Design a protein around this ligand. Structure first.
Ligand SMILES: *[C@@H]1O[C@H](CO)[C@@H](O[C@@H]2O[C@H](CO)[C@@H](O)[C@H](O)[C@H]2NC(C)=O)[C@H](O)[C@H]1NC(C)=O
Ligand SMILES: *[C@@H]1O[C@H](CO)[C@@H](O[C@@H]2O[C@H](CO)[C@@H](O)[C@H](O)[C@H]2NC(C)=O)[C@H](O)[C@H]1NC(C)=O
Ligand SMILES: *[C@@H]1O[C@H](CO)[C@@H](O)[C@H](O)[C@H]1NC(C)=O
Ligand SMILES: *[C@@H]1O[C@H](CO)[C@@H](O)[C@H](O)[C@H]1NC(C)=O
Lengths: 99, 47
């Protein structure tokens, strides 16, 4: 699997090795070398919507990142990101955190 | 707020409430707010 790994705070019984969520997907696991409970969560995802005045009127665009905190938004990662070809400029274009 | 002796305090918005709302509207909000979108864009509670 692919995801981000952090130390799992969930108390994990000695006979227990795997943890599963409501969907029963594995969310926690103990490292084989040393038993270390580690929570697995998916790498950051979010829908992207493009706001445009209209190609006839102009070519400027506005990009909205659906349901993402502005600081946690990945902009420096051009190489490893879906829709990688967009650098979506940077913070230089003023960024507003909307609801 | 006098209207021919008719009292409209319940239905009218209340400045005391931080979100200007009717006292009746305040009640209706509390009962049926079983679920929400959560507005959790930080997702820091997870992990
Ligand atoms: C009539 O409109 C007046 C405003 O011009 C309001 O005055 C009320 O009645 C007397 C004088 O009319 C005031 O001393 C009271 O203080 C007012 N009532 C309240 C609840 O403050 C009133 O809204 C209207 N009704 C009457 C009967 O005057
Ligand atoms: C209109 O209705 C309001 C709200 O029902 C009433 O205000 C009450 O006033 C008394 C006397 O101070 C208080 O003991 C009550 O607690 C008040 N009601 C509430 C719900 O807090 C009153 O009948 C009318 N008030 C006006 C200004 O017209
Ligand atoms: C290999 O893992 C086992 C237990 O999982 C234990 O011998 C030790 O932690 C590891 N061995 C070495 C040499 O690190
Ligand atoms: C994003 O996270 C930071 C720090 O937690 C802060 O700006 C704020 O809590 C979040 N922004 C929101 C909720 O708009």
């Amino acid at each position: 699997g692919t995801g981000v790994l952090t130390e799992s705070n969930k108390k994990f019984l000695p006979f227990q090795q795997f943890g599963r969520d409501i969907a029963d997907t594995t969310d926690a696991v103990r490292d084989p070398q040393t038993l270390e409970i580690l929570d697995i969560t998916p790498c950051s995802f979010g829908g992207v919507s493009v706001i445009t005045p209209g190609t006839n009127t102009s070519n400027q665009v506005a990009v909205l990142y659906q349901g993402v905190n502005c600081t946690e938004v990945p902009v420096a990662i051009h190489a490893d990101q879906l829709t990688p070809t967009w650098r979506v400029y940077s913070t230089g274009s003023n960024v507003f955190q909307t609801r | 707020k006098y209207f021919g002796g008719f009292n409209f305090s319940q239905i009218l918005p209340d400045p005391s409430k931080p979100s200007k709302r009717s006292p009746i509207e305040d009640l209706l909000f509390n009962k049926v707010t079983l679920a929400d979108a959560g507005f959790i864009k930080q997702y820091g509670d997870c992990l």
